[PDB]
Paper text:
The rixosome defined in Schizosaccharomyces pombe and humans performs diverse roles in pre‐ribosomal RNA processing and gene silencing. Here, we isolate and describe the conserved rixosome from Chaetomium thermophilum, which consists of two sub‐modules, the sphere‐like Rix1‐Ipi3‐Ipi1 and the butterfly‐like Las1‐Grc3 complex, connected by a flexible linker.
However, wild‐type ct PTF‐Las1 still co‐enriched Las1‐Grc3 together with Rix1‐Ipi1‐Ipi3, but not Rat1‐Rai1, and all five subunits remained stably associated during extended sucrose gradient centrifugation. Since the Rix1‐Ipi3‐Ipi1 complex is known to exhibit a large hollow sphere with a diameter of ~9 nm in yeast (Barrio‐Garcia et al, 2016; Kater et al, 2020) and the reconstituted ct Las1‐Grc3 heterodimer a butterfly‐like structure of 13 nm × 7 nm (Pillon et al, 2017), we conclude that we can observe the entire rixosome by electron microscopy. This suggests a flexible connection of Ipi1 to the spherical Rix1‐Ipi3 core on the isolated rixosome, but on pre‐60S particles Ipi1 becomes fixed upon its binding to Sda1 (see below). The hollow sphere‐like structure is formed by two copies each of Rix1 and Ipi3. Strikingly, AF2 multimer predicted with high consistency an interaction between the Las1‐CC and an intertwined bundle of two CC α‐helices formed by the two C‐termini of Ipi3.
Numbering used by the authors:
A (entry chain CT), B (entry chain CU): 1 to 393
C (entry chain CW), D (entry chain CV): 2 to 44, 52 to 469, 512 to 596
Amino acid sequence: MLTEEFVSAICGPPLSSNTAIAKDVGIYCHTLSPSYSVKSTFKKSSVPVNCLAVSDTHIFAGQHEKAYVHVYSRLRGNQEAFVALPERIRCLILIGDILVVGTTEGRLMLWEICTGRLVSTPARHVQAVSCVAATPSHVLTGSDDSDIHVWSLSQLLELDSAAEHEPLRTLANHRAAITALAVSPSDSADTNFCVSASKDKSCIIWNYQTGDALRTLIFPGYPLCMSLDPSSRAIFVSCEDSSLYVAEMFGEKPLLGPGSEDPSTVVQISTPFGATQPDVGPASCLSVSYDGTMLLTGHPRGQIMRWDISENKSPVELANLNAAVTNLIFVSPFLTSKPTKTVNIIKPSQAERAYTFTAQFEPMSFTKSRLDSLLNATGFPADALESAIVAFY
Amino acid sequence: MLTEEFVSAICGPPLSSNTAIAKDVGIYCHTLSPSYSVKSTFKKSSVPVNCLAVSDTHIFAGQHEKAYVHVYSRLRGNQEAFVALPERIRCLILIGDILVVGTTEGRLMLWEICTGRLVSTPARHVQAVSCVAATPSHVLTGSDDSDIHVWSLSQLLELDSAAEHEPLRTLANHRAAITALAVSPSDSADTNFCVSASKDKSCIIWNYQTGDALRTLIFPGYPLCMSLDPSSRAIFVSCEDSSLYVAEMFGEKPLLGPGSEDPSTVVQISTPFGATQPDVGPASCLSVSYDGTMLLTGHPRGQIMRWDISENKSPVELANLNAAVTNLIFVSPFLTSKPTKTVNIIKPSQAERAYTFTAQFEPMSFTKSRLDSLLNATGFPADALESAIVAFY
Amino acid sequence: TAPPDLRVVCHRLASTPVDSLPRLCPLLINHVLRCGGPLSEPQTSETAMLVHKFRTHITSLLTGKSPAGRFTAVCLIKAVIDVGGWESLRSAEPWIRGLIGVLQKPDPLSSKELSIVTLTKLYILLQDYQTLIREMATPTLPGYATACLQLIKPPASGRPLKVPLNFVDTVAWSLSKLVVLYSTTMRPFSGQIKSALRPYIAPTSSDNVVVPQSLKENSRNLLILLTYTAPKNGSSDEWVKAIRATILDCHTTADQVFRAVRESWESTTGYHIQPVNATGEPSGGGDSVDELPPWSGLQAGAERLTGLLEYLTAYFNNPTRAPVNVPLGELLDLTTRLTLVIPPSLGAEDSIETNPAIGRDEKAELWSALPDIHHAVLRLHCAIIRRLEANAIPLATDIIDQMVRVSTASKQLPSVRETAYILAKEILLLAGSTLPKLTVDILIPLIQSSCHDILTAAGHASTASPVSQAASALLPTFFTHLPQKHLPPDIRGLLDRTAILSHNQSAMLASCLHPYRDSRGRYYPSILPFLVRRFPRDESVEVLRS
Amino acid sequence: TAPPDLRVVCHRLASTPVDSLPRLCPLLINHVLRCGGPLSEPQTSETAMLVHKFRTHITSLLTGKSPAGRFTAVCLIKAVIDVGGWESLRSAEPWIRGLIGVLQKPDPLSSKELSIVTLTKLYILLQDYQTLIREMATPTLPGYATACLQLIKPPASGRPLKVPLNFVDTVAWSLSKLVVLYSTTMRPFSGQIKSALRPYIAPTSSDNVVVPQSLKENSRNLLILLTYTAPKNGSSDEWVKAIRATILDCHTTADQVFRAVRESWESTTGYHIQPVNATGEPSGGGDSVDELPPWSGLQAGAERLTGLLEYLTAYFNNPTRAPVNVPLGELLDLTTRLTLVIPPSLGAEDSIETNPAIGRDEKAELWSALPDIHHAVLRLHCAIIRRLEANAIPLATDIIDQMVRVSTASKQLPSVRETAYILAKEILLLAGSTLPKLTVDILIPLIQSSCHDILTAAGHASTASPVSQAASALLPTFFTHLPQKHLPPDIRGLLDRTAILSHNQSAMLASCLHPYRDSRGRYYPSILPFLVRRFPRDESVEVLRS
């Protein structure tokens, strides 16, 4: 009853010669539903894992071993900008109109797309920030020093501060580099949770505002990329052993809830949802569709493979991009309403200026009148017509 | 932060002479909170258990070994009517403006207070209907033949139906007379449950619209009277052993929910919440306050006992009415808004007449105008005043 | 020292010319609403002195001959009575006489309307204190009622209304409150009020004047509330006689409307359809007091029937002083009679039995006029449900049958469909959960129509429409208050698709909480992913996250 | 055979006299809205013949000299264009010329307003088809714009406006749509539109005319939307220059308003307060094109400042054609400057530093006029939040400080409190969850005030009030989007009592989902029994029963 689309990104040299694929393309746009096709491509891009962000108007891409961000316009269909940042980028995401960027130096910056501010935190992490997740209220950064720092967006973003920023909390139960970070859509203090994975083959569900660790899970291989289902009921985890694992948090024995065990106890997940033949390789990117029935994985040998979660059948290969696939981002089929539109980005400048916001204002029917009720009604409303006849005579 | 009131009813001869209590009074009105007091009394009444119904305007009382219903006016403070019904009454309750009455013959009637209809069902129960509970959509009647019949209000109440009425369902897992019946406030098909107790020391929680039996509980003594907590999380059960029992449906191990066992399994409730010395006697009537923090019990020796559910302390005696206490009904401290007020009842007449409804129509602000917005506003609204000045010049 | 607001009021009242004061009235009202405390003080400090000079200035503005000054004093009296309380109510008596004098004097009509509103507020506020009722309300009230009835009385023999119908609406609105509050004082004026409000109860096209809807509503409200003034506690008897007379008037107009169609309907109550002359156009009404004004023409008869049905609706809208007997059986029989006559579908004109003596144009006009009568019947059912609540459960089957027949006959009108959706929501809220299978089966086309309207508005099968909003409000009720076991799987799938594509949180939540089980005894998948994706941070999903 | 509705339309149009047709317009509109299908058919069957006769009769009504006939034709053209579609749009060209001719002819002004609405609907519907834009919209549009600007042009040198201000509101509303749709055609008229709409942007008391609020709103909307007509894609530059000129005008008026008070404020952006002559009343404005009309008096200056703040609000209300630069820093500095000046509490008049040369009456007028300026500032903050959404997070601390200072200074005014509650809900929805302890501590009196207003309305500590409704809407937000750990136990208990006694389902649900843990580290008892007792069958408790 819908059409569904997703955006792919590749990295590295082309793997096989004479496959007739374009060598210059680095970002693809596909239509997953109803039938597989390619809408458009973007040229000259090499994006590592977790360095791609997709909005309705722009695609932001972090470049491998390079501090620049390539910004492409989805509206015009070309490359918009070559943004230069102070330090090399390990990961970047997009929350609202803010690009949140972690670096090799361990710093965190927030670049506001519309205002051009570059809010740079002191290097709280000792080594490189590997994964970043965000909410409307908090920003969570996991680094190579096994510390997941939880920061407040309000303290980082606000204007008149000249003092250094500090994280609200540090979640340090992990003992190795944080590979992935996923966050529940709830922002309430009691009901929220964030799910993190590390190189020590451990995956912890936290309550990040309280700082507590709700649940601990152990996998046979260390988790590469993670995604929760749209209902926030299950976790899909890719691993180094070329397998995909599913964890039901509200299944037979709930991981979280009234029927759960003690939070100090450890749950080990050993049954693979699926496995991948090693000529395809372990999945490097993992994404879940809008309905959640069907899933997409990207592999370093070029194959994009579709998994049926409900049907539990064998995965089928969509296409071979002849390059290591690093990012798959689903785009929502329904379009949301936002009062502004970001047609163009504003590059970060350290020059002192008044605070300015740059966007296109969208028609949102904020101004309402009785004349609009006259206009939009089929015919004329009865009371307004009666007043018109009284005014006529 | 509130005042709370309850209505008591007694039965039988006065137990002790020279106690200076009035012998003619049968119904009392008390104030439980803030301090114990008696507002008013009603004369010449002898009410068995489950035969008292309290509304905002009237108190309906079934008489012992007598087919009449005494109707008292809470507004005027006197006895309104001596209603005559075809058969002797074992139990009666009030849903909306309808008095639902079970008999010794096993018949069920619905007497509409405002219209005077007396809808009499065929005697589906072989013996006397002992308990009646109501839902806005359904009516549940438990009898001495161990069958709880679930009836639809819409099929009983409708006008042009001249055929005999039939129950929607029959719940017959019990093997003895149904002593008590409680209904959850949920009216949905999936989430509702009804709690029933029988003389075989059994208490079954059903889903009455599906007809399934969700849970089975066994008590050391057969349950006399039962009341659910306002949150529908616990059951309070009085028994023949002069003790009160509490069962938590969502406690450590839930009786109902995801953490519950198989519905065929049996849970035995053996830990008494409290006990009562046999000079006071086992509690014959049971009620729960609006907040649910405190509880009230009536006893055959006259004592009204107040129980602290949260504090779990020893019970205290409010008063000795020197007669067997058969009913305690709490009245809600906050007043609800109802479009009609039943000042007077209409006695049931079998004579053929047009369908007429008798009530006083209450002010409900159903008619709204801009002149009302002019009147109720402090001063005048700015736009209306501007239009007034334009019309003035 | 005085508060700044009071001395600003005094200086602006002293300095300003009287003719420019209505333009400064908003700021003066704002300032005097600010300083309620000095006026609330019971009556030397400068605050009390400025309060005394302020009240003296109000009295001098009111009594003096200046229409601008009278308008400004009306506004100031309204605000001062709003903020002062008992101390202002003690001295409001020369203000009451002054406002009645403003109504008597020839002034701009907006000043008269504001005086009417201010006097109504004065009487409602004086109702609290019995001594002030004896001193103020009882003597001054007959003069106010006479002054209003002088304005709204029609001298229709000589000349038409010099008073606009909006002002008649204002006077009827004020008298609607005052008949409820002061029954015995307003009792002598009831015969005049009935004669004044006779033309606005059910206007027709033959009346040749356009009546605003608010005028009809407040005229009906005032004639229903006039039963309060019945002597010797006769309110209930007058109410019953009036509603039964309205029902009989509906039936007599329905005879002349349905002259063209042979009626198979037979009355439960015992009404008999009189023979109707086939020659000429339908006609009715009269110049008598009990009869509504005369009409001629089939469209005028349909308008009269619609106005009578709206009057019957206003019966259930207004309150009563004493318990009254509501003839539900007579209204049910009347609505059954009006809903049994349905217009033919296209190509099915010959199927309906008609009197051969009637011309084809009258038949076409009748087929055009039927859906408005049906819409008025459905609105009457909505008002009956709203007033009765759980007491309207025994009428549910008949109202369902009438609603299904009407919505099937007039499926192509969006207004009839919208009223059917609004009625169906209340029906299912009362007695939808225990419906049999056949009732669900005849309700199925209404569900299909509502889902089609919602999907058309969303564009998935566009701008919001009132029929679309009514169907969107109806959409969660199809899950919550309808038996899912009786619904076919196609209807449930259509409902789920409509809820998803409409982005309706309530319908998606209700579909999540009410799963559908088919013949194979296995549940269909929930639409929870769509709900969490579209509304992640909403409160309902937060309750789901408990 | 034709449908009955179309034949009824033809017969009633043939039989009725032309002067009584406006009274029959509702039934004619209903019948022609019914028969949309015959008009939708592309143009012998009787249906097509009756459609041709109907369109011919509409054209004859429109072109003929009868104001009643022209009014009826306007209504029929509106309904026919509503229901017919492309077949009516391809022939609406003589109807377009006829409606413009109706506007040119001296007719009743309601007919002119209906012609304006019908022509606006015609242009919006013609926007879909490019060929019809080339054939119909482009030639006819300059004549329509000239006809409207002829009406709303002020001949103020010769006479006041012969046209009422509601009709000016109508014309501005139509031109607001047409400048967005047809920028290049409406480009030559922008200089005339600016001169026509100059007096209604920020009216003062010195203007001596009462301006309706809708006229000011649509005048501001049209002057903001006139940037669409800027040549060579200059829309964004004109928008930025206009908003910065408005900010500078606010600052220059604020100088003459706050002449009486020594200001400790120093600008972040770099604005400097010019010296102000202490002698005489404050004055400003001018007759220039860039300057707003002149004002004199402190109350007039406050009205001008409030109107300029409402203009700045309308900047965020209206859309833009191209991306624009929004000076949030300048607006933040301006609002900081206006909110820093607060009126003294009673007995604290001497604490505020004032210029000794100013009279005491001017100080009193300033203390009276400050809360309205503060209310306009808070409404500006609300509009900024509504447009920016998550981009307004950096301004949250400053808006919180301004809101707390304003609500503390003007605690006795219910309107200021209501606007503070409405602002506080949006503030807490954006950035309330991560607030520090001191921000919660200064927010505590606002929570106390809101709970007191709710309890006063409920009567537990009465009729509903707008401030009460605003506080009731704010009440669930105090649980959902405020740190419960920072709240004292007294404030949490007051919130729970307010939620229980208010019978508000959302606040009780939010208190159930957000438990309070004290310093003793155990949770307070929940208020779930009150919620289940008051709302047993509601949907939220049904979700809790999952």
